[PDB]
């Protein structure tokens, strides 16, 4: 069957406007495994952006972390857009800070 | 401890994309990685630096390779234009009396349908496309065999050899970094959100106090960082203004007591 992604977006460490960090956008619940996931600084997708291997939970639902290094100053607003056969257009998940 | 492999083939990989791939999990730790545009099984994270029985990967590899041929061939055994998605959950847990309990189930586009029965030494399940793949693999030379070897030897041998060689890894305790922040609800309301960063193992408990007395765990949410440490958070609705009376309590292996997190 088809299963629609849950999307979350968090840094590795506590957000501190100034020091080097790591932004994670994690997607988990979906099926089929086909998926495009991208990390926006302010509006534009980011260039150097890794993504771990793809696995699946105890009910075959795939899950997939994308991530990237970064540094936030209360200028920028980083966020996570995700498209998949089940979402109707992208969902963007604004990275709410210290959460 | 369980050693489990997650196995995945799709009929139509999107361009530049592994038609097959596997990851190997020592518990909630990912030790092995294998796509199909490399045909090479490789260690991940800490498990790279493990001194191993060395000729250990060339059996992981040949194993996984042989497993991929069969996977991409289950597709041929199949009805239509599809496209399909076929999944493996294969491994074994070790338990208190020098024992292994082997595991072998498969699913079809997120739906469970095949299982390897080991008394009968086979690939069962009565719903149609089961029969189908069972039988291609059934009538396929000593593959049924090659599995048992996998499931009763290779797996327990592997798992026992991680337990001895990277035991220390298995028991890494990293305490979470805490933060309690407040954002606004409907006027008259606000939400507290206790956020826990980094942290491994995964077990972790959060909760809320208003002046010391328990005032709910919250809505909670969970996921991975990329070093394979973890992230957690719980949010709770509170009467706007009541705010500073509250605090968050975290309970985690890396900690000696529990810990208070003031706003």
UniProtKB/Swiss-Prot annotation, chain A:
- Positions where Pyrrolidone carboxylic acid occurs in the chain: 2
Q: Name one GO biological process term.
A: cellular response to iron(III) ion
Mutation: residue 60 to V; reported impact is: Increases tendency towards amyloid formation
Tell me, in one coarse class, where this protein mainly resides.
Answer: secreted
Known disease link: Immunodeficiency 43: A disorder characterized by marked reduction in serum concentrations of immunoglobulins and albumin, and hypoproteinemia due to hypercatabolism. Patients may suffer from recurrent respiratory tract infections and severe skin disease. Amyloidosis, hereditary systemic 6: A form of hereditary systemic amyloidosis, a disorder characterized by amyloid deposition in multiple tissues resulting in a wide clinical spectrum. AMYLD6 is mainly characterized by gastrointestinal and cardiac symptoms. Neurologic involvement, sicca syndrome, and carpal tunnel syndrome may also be present. Inheritance is autosomal dominant.
State the oligomer form and interacting partners: Heterodimer of an alpha chain and a beta chain. Beta-2-microglobulin is the beta-chain of major histocompatibility complex class I molecules. Polymers of beta 2-microglobulin can be found in tissues from patients on long-term hemodialysis. B2M alone (not in complex with HLA-I) interacts with M.tuberculosis EsxA (ESAT-6) and an EsxA-EsxB (CFP-10) complex; the tripartite complex can be detected in the host endoplasmic reticulum. The B2M-EsxA complex can be detected in patients with pleural tuberculosis and is stable from pH 4.0 to 8.0 and in the presence of 2M NaCl.
Please identify the protein, giving its name as recorded.
Answer: Beta-2-microglobulin
| Organism (species) | Homo sapiens (Human)
Q: Which gene encodes it?
A: B2M
From Swiss-Prot, chain B:
Q: Does the keyword Metal-binding apply?
A: no
Single GO MF descriptor: IgG binding
Lyase as a keyword of this entry, yes or no, is no
UniProt region (Alpha-2), positions on chain: 84-173
Membrane-topology annotation of the record: Single-pass type I membrane protein
State the compartments where it is located: Cell membrane; Endosome membrane
According to the UniProt record, one GO cellular component term is:
extracellular space
Sorted alphabetically, the keyword list is: Cell membrane, Disulfide bond, Endosome, Glycoprotein, IgG-binding protein, Immunoglobulin domain, Membrane, Phosphoprotein, Receptor, Signal, Transmembrane, Transmembrane helix
- Where are the residues of the annotated region Alpha-1? 1-83
| Glycan attachment positions | 98
Mind listing the GO biological process terms from this record?
IgG immunoglobulin transcytosis in epithelial cells mediated by FcRn immunoglobulin receptor; immune response
- Function statement: Cell surface receptor that transfers passive humoral immunity from the mother to the newborn. Binds to the Fc region of monomeric immunoglobulin gamma and mediates its selective uptake from milk. IgG in the milk is bound at the apical surface of the intestinal epithelium. The resultant FcRn-IgG complexes are transcytosed across the intestinal epithelium and IgG is released from FcRn into blood or tissue fluids. Throughout life, contributes to effective humoral immunity by recycling IgG and extending its half-life in the circulation. (Microbial infection) Acts as an uncoating receptor for a panel of echoviruses including Echovirus 5, 6, 7, 9, 11, 13, 25 and 29.
- This chain belongs to the protein called IgG receptor FcRn large subunit p51
What fragment of the whole protein does this chain represent? 28 to 290 of 365
């Amino acid at each position: 069957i088809q299963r629609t992604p849950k999307i979350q977006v968090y840094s590795r460490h506590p957000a501190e406007n100034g020091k080097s960090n790591f932004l994670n956008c994690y997607v988990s619940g979906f099926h089929p495994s086909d998926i495009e996931v991208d990390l926006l600084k302010n509006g534009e997708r980011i260039e150097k952006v890794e993504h771990s291997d793809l696995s699946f939970s105890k009910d075959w639902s795939f899950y997939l972390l994308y991530y990237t290094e970064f540094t936030p100053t209360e200028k920028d607003e980083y966020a996570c857009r995700v498209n998949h056969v089940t979402l109707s257009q992208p969902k963007i998940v604004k990275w709410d800070r210290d959460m | 401890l369980s050693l489990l492999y997650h196995l995945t083939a799709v009929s139509s990989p999107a361009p530049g994309t592994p038609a097959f791939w596997v990851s190997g999990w020592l518990g909630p730790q990912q030790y092995l990685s294998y796509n199909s545009l490399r045909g090479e099984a490789e260690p991940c994270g800490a498990w790279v630096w493990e001194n191993q029985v060395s000729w250990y990967w060339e059996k992981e590899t040949t194993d996984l390779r042989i497993k991929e041929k069969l996977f991409l061939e289950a597709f041929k055994a199949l009805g239509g234009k599809g496209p399909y998605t076929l999944q493996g959950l294969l491994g074994c847990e070790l338990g208190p009396d020098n024992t292994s309990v082997p595991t072998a189930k498969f699913a079809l586009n997120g739906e469970e349908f095949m299982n390897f029965d080991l008394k009968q030494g086979t690939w069962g399940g009565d719903w149609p496309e089961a029969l189908a793949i069972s039988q291609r693999w059934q009538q396929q030379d000593k593959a049924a065999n090659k599995e048992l070897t996998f499931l009763l030897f290779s797996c327990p041998h592997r798992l026992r050899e991680h337990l001895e060689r990277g035991r220390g890894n298995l028991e890494w305790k990293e305490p979470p970094s805490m933060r309690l922040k407040a954002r606004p609800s409907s006027p008259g309301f606000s939400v507290l959100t206790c956020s826990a960063f980094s942290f491994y193992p995964p077990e972790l408990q959060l909760r809320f106090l208003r002046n010391g007395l328990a005032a709910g765990t919250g809505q909670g949410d969970f996921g991975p960082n990329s070093d394979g440490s973890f992230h957690a958070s719980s949010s709770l609705t509170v009467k706007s203004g009541d705010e500073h009376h509250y605090c968050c309590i975290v309970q985690h292996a890396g900690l000696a007591q529990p810990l208070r997190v003031e706003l």
